[PDB]
């Protein structure tokens, strides 16, 4: 009865999809044609009719209740939400208003043109049933070509809103026409429509938040998440369908959008499996419904064949294209007025794009089957089948021509040269590997002609004067922006940036590239991270100011007692026992209030509210029983902490992105100067570019520091989160290196990987994002301070705390080095001889003045009320004299300042090409310095060391008698290093032994 | 009616699974207890009964038809087949015979003990329903501990055969007992049982091969094959259910096993999705069935509560454990007699392991609901519920104690020290990264106490004399075997070995380690690759000897005409038209035979068969109409090539593994000698170990070369396949390096990686595995020969071909260099002053005598009838003199010999640790040598070069007046290289410039 048709439909869909991949037309039109010829055969041969009747004439209710929600949820689950939510207002207003105007114009045109005796409800049904779309076919081509991501996102996100609101309009009008017994009074109808509008999406959002909350607490598991997510989706659909007739699909689409939004709380394997499963289900539904529409349109087309009917179909297709063009043109200036308008080229390609799909045919078969023995269903089905096959041929065939006529199909010259370079490098490497393989013992037998023929990759992208000064400046600007984009991509690949920050940086860089003589401004980035101050911040401040046997479990039990007491009154809003347990609960709350009175009753407002509620409880009968429930309001004093935590989480989510953007920009600017130092020629050009980059760096650093200063309760959390993520990433890299080296077996490596993944997932939702730091922990947390509690106590006894107001000056250039400084709260500016910098909490000032005892070379200007920790120089000297263990503290000072003074030198020499700041820092950290006292102030360079750098002292080469000042790198030319008894300038070296 | 119960079951399963992960007992027992209390509540409160009736009392047919096949197919799909198929006979005989003896003993015990008025049919139905197992809870723990993979594979593969035979026996005897109208005659019953035995699995194999053949021809797709595979599984089940009542599950399990076997023809994403989906479906079935058994056993336990019944249950559990132990003990010596026996410890842990699962309760509920209003169903359900809960408690709780009492739970000391070293390295690296992060500007604010504490990984494991000479020899042997295992793991990780070859090598290495004073023999490896000569080879030889307008579409159309002519006669085995089209086909075949007679009719046997068939066609009526179909035998002449291709594919599949094992061993032996040179101290020890390793090296190389010589038609294909795979892997590595460097955008990198994957998938099933190579292609295919067709033609004109028989000597040591030799066919041995070697096709001999014109240093002895190419030395000299382009041929000779002479020097000095031969060969390939003539025979070492090696000539240092012979590496100490006009010994250098 059923099995033959479904198996044949799956086979035919498989064949057509696998065979029309290269062809331009989509695979669906040939599916429709196969369904048509199957319908002809079933009309002729009775056995095919017997095997077709049970599924072609399907009960329309199961169609409208099963096939539609799967398709809508798939189209919801398909995309990303960030691009959608970033441009939600545009697509929402466009979809809604275009849909309603298309429906009404198509309806009135049907009245004016068809010469049928159709009432208004049928005409609105017609307009709403040919307004559904399916941009899948095109959006795939647009994403493949990659002309514009915003256009593809807009044309693909129009689909959901269009289909959902078309379904809703169809549902209300179908209930109006085919079920006449339903009352069409104004008040009930508007109440029902408002219910559809609000009760659907809110219910979907509620269940989405509930299931995300349950899902975030499941660790190292996969089978639980899949079943609970599928159950959540199905129960949302079932509840939505039980309460309302049509709001279920809206609840499902909003649930899908939200559960796709919170991607970080689901393991990647679970989400990729879920995407694949929903996609397979949708594809099966699509194939089966197209078979069904083909057979049912063939079996019922001989009763409505008419030449003027074909003329009506043709002019209807022309009319609907015209109407879509007209509404897009009408809304183009209004959409341009919002600051996020679209080009006319985008408008025309998007109105010619977009075409009918499976949704229209689903609703059409619903109409046809509900119509029964009438011509109205045949007219509906014939018209919609004609328009869908017509657009599936015409638009999906000529869309490539429309792309090629306009400038969208063109490929940028930089992308072409990138392709040429990449393919040349790939070809050269493959040729080199082939030459190497031809020299081996084992593989010389293989015939290399077929071998080389088999392996080949082609090109997918091809088959003095002031005017001279301006041209050189433009060339430098272009290469500047290219190098900055390269650094951004490299740093994203290594993994210190989130995807959103990289997308923002790339968009800003390409916008600056498109604009003439415009660099990357900071004002746009300032607006990017300056979303901190919004009405949520005012709400947080208000909530902070409203809030202020003593175990926490006491009030926890009070809250759960209130929760259980909710049930009897909410059932009332058995009587004798209910009153008795009410009396028992009243007595329990009375003794709880007595205990609270024993705790000095210091509560301000909740005490008054509890007193009022107790007065009500201890004290027209129906009204009193209805209004004796204000005790429900007592839970809000426990609901406030949850709200302040969630608003803190929100502000954390914003601040993390804003912080990452600044960090990526500052790293890129730091590296690109050393990039351009190897390239630039004109002195004025390099001076101007360096000045501009330094100005941007200073502005960004100062603004970010002030933003951190504004409220540290979130900056502390986000910085700790980033630090722990970095540590776990490097531990995972070390684990994989050990696995590749073979020293760790595969099972143990998998166990270690599992532990690391568990730690990272615990990180993903562990902190409350509000850790307050104390200053003494900051003093004891310094790198060289750590490792000796005795030295920590000595410093803490000998440290001093100073406080300064805005605009003051702490130390000036050339003054005597009174001691080492340690900033513990605030922000400060450091200006000294040309260069300028900004220092924040967690740094120290002036290690030269306490190690080399040289005069200061900077000036310190306070920017806010700063708290600083101060150690006198003589105390540092006596601490150096006291502690002389193997990890000597002064050795730690020299190591730290050596790293800080050697990283810029290495990056200037650019010795480690393709290395970020982190890798160079780690490589220099692996090294250690060795004392020259035990080696007679002579050092021999061996092959074990990789890089050597001298920090202080005068380097005397044993051979050739070369005198080298400090600090600078020494190459492999020097073989022996010699020093004498130079107490005035103590020599200091640094070596990096390789393995 | 249904939704509440299924949703609650899914919720309860998720909660119990997520909450009993740390607890030792499985979640299933608490699932059963929750079902039991739900049954109590449903018995008490009528509303719960109303919501339970529709699923608790489910129609037994849908249970037995839906729940069982999903579980069996999941258990089949879970395992890997290679370990199963490698030990298939053991598990097959054990499961079958243990099942039948368990059934019969349980039956006779039921008669002897229960004092029930049961017949033998019910008793052995009970025995079959108690023999089903579910070792998932035990196999998961055993794989977690990893004592023995063979034991886990055996105990987990016993499950499939045990369940399949149990369900078959249940089906047949349940149909006997509950449907008495079925005839129990001997002949029909044995025919039905034979049908169940054979027609199921062969049908499954047929559909598995068909679907694998369809799926191997689908490229770059991800949705078509998922639906194809699911439809294939469902249609196999449906056809199996139509034809036979029970063989469907056997068809399904064999289909799952085969489709899991051919893993390489399916994309990894699709297979992981399919695994996850089937696993989720099975888990849902398990949870629902345990809820259902709980509620039905609670609602129907008050009619069979009896103290002696509980006593019967207890002694039944004891009896079934005793019987399982007895059968395992009985079959232990017979299984030891096959050479693959098991220890008594494995036997006892496996008989105490294994426990009842979902299959038993499924069949139990089938019995219960088919019984109706009787006590027999209650007794069945009570007994099986009691035994399943009893074993899920006792065995799943005490299995860890059984592991800890025996020596299986112990951890090897080498694994403990490896874990300690890995965790120490991880901790050190994490500490270093933390120290680096504490020095940054941005992240100094984060409170490091909560940071470090969070990210911490802990060891998950712990919480003169001859006797001296023997001890050092044993220590050296253990170090050698550890290093060989390390090299095998590293080479597998880089990717020149298949998984199976690595598994074989690791097993052989650990077996040699366990055995005292035993190294890795070659006889076992010889037997490993010596599976070439089996009855498949004899069949291939027989098929080769039987087989010998001419366009091939003519015979293709003849074949399809025969295929279409199959249908009318097979429908006969409308009449007038059938006879007329038979006459038309006869006339067409007659003119085809006339054309064949025009082609000299040289066919030996098929001509006679065609003549006989034509005589039959041109010529008791029923017998003639039945026997006029022998024309169907004409297709075998076209079926033979397909069978010879498939047997060639089989021998290719064997030889690829046999070749990979040898290649891995040879690389390991090449590397272990060098790395043991850095550890050994005693001269006699190193001499003996080097001699043994060299003996194994020589034996393996000679044997592999002879194996290649045996039939080149497969060796050519496998070597070309390996070469193309290597080239594609290095191209993908270069693509990913470009993506990491940022020079290629992510879209284009994805496109290139997709093209690479397409090429790999085309490789996976492209070749026919029989490419024959010509010798002139071997001459023109040499590395330095290529690049000049003029030089190729000059060589081909001037080359000579020589042929030699076995045992002859071509050249001897110390003779004048007559010229260069090029081996093109055969195998030769090279012995010269101590070292010995074997050479095969595609190599050349003696570049010294043609470059340096020095006397030969080797002796060449033929091992078979060899064809060789010979070029006279004077012709090589005149070819050098003729061609003096920038890529000079003599420069190519020097480059090739420099690589071949510099790689062993790099290995001996061991400069680049952690690299295999491939990486060092690639690194040396990038380098290029520079002529000293244009640089006044003096060279300056700069920082661009990475490593320099001198091949020929005397190295004169400008400084310190140092003389260096050749060939040896020069360190960074030397800065300037000098040479004079030395015509007798031409200086030759080689440098590797870094980037
Ligand atoms: C509901 C609509 C029923 C219409 C009435 C109808 O025809 O019912 C008929 C029964 O028909 C069925 O049993 C239909 C439901 C079975 C299909 C469910 C597929 C689930 C897809 C997977 C979703 C997985 C969960 C989410 C992932 C009979 O009723 P009648 O003919 O009216 O008499």
PDB file of C-alpha atoms and ligand atoms in Angstrom, chain A residues 59 61-62 65-66 230 233-234 277-278 281, ligand 1:
ATOM      1  CA  UNK A  59      -5.333  12.845   4.583  1.00  0.00           C
ATOM      2  CA  UNK A  61      -4.379  17.031   8.126  1.00  0.00           C
ATOM      3  CA  UNK A  62      -1.262  14.882   8.470  1.00  0.00           C
ATOM      4  CA  UNK A  65       0.644  18.920  10.607  1.00  0.00           C
ATOM      5  CA  UNK A  66       3.830  16.946   9.787  1.00  0.00           C
ATOM      6  CA  UNK A 230      14.628  16.001  20.082  1.00  0.00           C
ATOM      7  CA  UNK A 233      11.498  20.117  20.036  1.00  0.00           C
ATOM      8  CA  UNK A 234       8.658  17.622  19.760  1.00  0.00           C
ATOM      9  CA  UNK A 277      19.777  14.384  10.931  1.00  0.00           C
ATOM     10  CA  UNK A 278      17.350  17.273  10.560  1.00  0.00           C
ATOM     11  CA  UNK A 281      14.617  14.379   7.380  1.00  0.00           C
TER      12      UNK A 281
HETATM   13  C1  LIG C   1      -0.650  13.643  13.424  1.00  0.00           C
HETATM   14  C2  LIG C   1      -1.568  13.722  12.213  1.00  0.00           C
HETATM   15  C3  LIG C   1      -2.552  12.563  12.123  1.00  0.00           C
HETATM   16  C4  LIG C   1      -3.585  12.748  11.020  1.00  0.00           C
HETATM   17  C5  LIG C   1      -4.701  11.721  11.104  1.00  0.00           C
HETATM   18  C6  LIG C   1      -4.391  10.412  10.437  1.00  0.00           C
HETATM   19  O1  LIG C   1      -4.434  10.209   9.252  1.00  0.00           O
HETATM   20  O2  LIG C   1      -4.058   9.485  11.332  1.00  0.00           O
HETATM   21  C7  LIG C   1      -3.891   8.127  10.920  1.00  0.00           C
HETATM   22  C8  LIG C   1      -2.681   7.605  11.657  1.00  0.00           C
HETATM   23  O3  LIG C   1      -1.553   8.334  11.196  1.00  0.00           O
HETATM   24  C9  LIG C   1      -0.469   8.385  11.956  1.00  0.00           C
HETATM   25  O4  LIG C   1      -0.196   7.547  12.776  1.00  0.00           O
HETATM   26  C10 LIG C   1       0.336   9.611  11.643  1.00  0.00           C
HETATM   27  C11 LIG C   1       1.526   9.844  12.550  1.00  0.00           C
HETATM   28  C12 LIG C   1       2.684   8.949  12.145  1.00  0.00           C
HETATM   29  C13 LIG C   1       3.815   9.683  11.448  1.00  0.00           C
HETATM   30  C14 LIG C   1       4.783  10.323  12.430  1.00  0.00           C
HETATM   31  C15 LIG C   1       6.172  10.522  11.846  1.00  0.00           C
HETATM   32  C16 LIG C   1       7.167  11.068  12.856  1.00  0.00           C
HETATM   33  C17 LIG C   1       8.399  11.660  12.196  1.00  0.00           C
HETATM   34  C18 LIG C   1       9.602  11.685  13.121  1.00  0.00           C
HETATM   35  C19 LIG C   1       9.523  12.755  14.198  1.00  0.00           C
HETATM   36  C20 LIG C   1      10.475  12.473  15.351  1.00  0.00           C
HETATM   37  C21 LIG C   1      10.286  13.401  16.538  1.00  0.00           C
HETATM   38  C22 LIG C   1      10.947  14.750  16.314  1.00  0.00           C
HETATM   39  C23 LIG C   1      12.361  14.621  15.769  1.00  0.00           C
HETATM   40  C24 LIG C   1      -5.160   7.301  11.157  1.00  0.00           C
HETATM   41  O5  LIG C   1      -6.203   8.161  11.555  1.00  0.00           O
HETATM   42  P1  LIG C   1      -7.408   8.529  10.528  1.00  0.00           P
HETATM   43  O6  LIG C   1      -6.967   8.093   9.164  1.00  0.00           O
HETATM   44  O7  LIG C   1      -7.928   9.910  10.770  1.00  0.00           O
HETATM   45  O8  LIG C   1      -8.516   7.431  11.085  1.00  0.00           O
END
